[PDB]
Amino acid sequence: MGLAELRELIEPEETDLRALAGREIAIDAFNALYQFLTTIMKDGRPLMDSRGRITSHLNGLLYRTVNLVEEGIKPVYVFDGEPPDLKLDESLVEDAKRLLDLMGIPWVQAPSEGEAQCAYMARCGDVWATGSQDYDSLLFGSPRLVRNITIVGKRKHPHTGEIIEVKPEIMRLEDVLDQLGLESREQLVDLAILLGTDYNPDGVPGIGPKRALQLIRKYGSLDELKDTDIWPKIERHLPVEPEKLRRLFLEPEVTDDYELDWDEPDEEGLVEFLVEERDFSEDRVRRAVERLKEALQELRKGG
Ligand SMILES: [Cl-]
Ligand SMILES: [Cl-]
């Protein structure tokens, strides 16, 4: 799974949404849509319009984005481009972009990895953090990652009926390094390569997470593990040469070509799209548009 395996060591800062009031967050769009598609359901299936087309993605993107802006959070959604060679239905993606345009919520087309683009925007100081369920943006150098941003809330377990609560949680790159006893992001990347990433998802069986971490700490780097006895097992399992894997995380393809704005929603266009084409409740959509205008306004009047 990757860095997620060292969750006991990482331990984020558990917070609430109102603590992120005023923060711009670069949310990985593919990750967000996946959460919406897999968790917003009716009788065990995704929400659908009267023609049978999926709507869970539009539902989440509209109503949860409005909720975030009501807590003072300014989201920007960032979409995957072409993945690197080692690495969602396109209609869902175009639905998403159309919706955000109508809502006035900014988005960016990444040239390759969305999570890398999010991290770059955070490094440049154009957003405060990245927002995803994945830990990838840290490896791409994001100074801050907020997890659970698209799924904050409470539910009952179908089985136990207990109140499961999901809260937003913050991880700061600098603290993650300290928590793991590492010196640099470069070592974090080397560690992640041992554990397995999207570019090498098997990791290195035979090396558990604690062992991986100990190795990186003791020997310093993946490069320096060449002179050791464990190397052949590593070289066997790494699909490509290690430096090319490192380069993907340390020098990801990203773009400068964006300018972040939060515009007024287009009430009538939203109604045409969601209500008339996708069978959303008109009263609910219209009310969401009013809630959104007011929330944007409340952020404007303090700067
Ligand atoms: Cl709602
Ligand atoms: Cl609805």
From Swiss-Prot:
Gene3D superfamilies documented for this protein: 5' to 3' exonuclease, C-terminal subdomain, 5'-nuclease
Residues that coordinate or bind Mg(2+) 1: 28, 80, 113, 115
Cofactor info, note text: Binds 2 magnesium ions per subunit. They probably participate in the reaction catalyzed by the enzyme. May bind an additional third magnesium ion after substrate binding.
A Pfam family of this chain: XPG_I
GO biological process: DNA repair; DNA replication, removal of RNA primer
Keyword terms: DNA damage, DNA repair, DNA replication, Endonuclease, Exonuclease, Hydrolase, Magnesium, Metal-binding, Nuclease
Cofactor: Mg(2+)
Alphabetized GO MF terms: 5'-3' exonuclease activity; 5'-flap endonuclease activity; DNA binding; magnesium ion binding
N-domain as annotated region, ranges: 1-87
Domain of life: Archaea
EC number: 3.1.-.-
Region of interest (I-domain), residue spans: 88-220
Binding site for Mg(2+) 2: 134, 136, 198
PANTHER family associated with the record: FLAP ENDONUCLEASE 1 (PTHR11081:SF9), FLAP ENDONUCLEASE FAMILY MEMBER (PTHR11081)
Function according to Swiss-Prot or TrEMBL: Structure-specific nuclease with 5'-flap endonuclease and 5'-3' exonuclease activities involved in DNA replication and repair. During DNA replication, cleaves the 5'-overhanging flap structure that is generated by displacement synthesis when DNA polymerase encounters the 5'-end of a downstream Okazaki fragment. Binds the unpaired 3'-DNA end and kinks the DNA to facilitate 5' cleavage specificity. Cleaves one nucleotide into the double-stranded DNA from the junction in flap DNA, leaving a nick for ligation. Also involved in the base excision repair (BER) pathway.
Subunit structure: Interacts with PCNA. PCNA stimulates the nuclease activity without altering cleavage specificity.
UniProt similarity note: Belongs to the XPG/RAD2 endonuclease family. FEN1 subfamily.
Protein name: Flap endonuclease 1
Lineage summary: Archaea, Methanobacteriati, Methanobacteriota, Methanomada group, Methanopyri
Underlying gene: fen
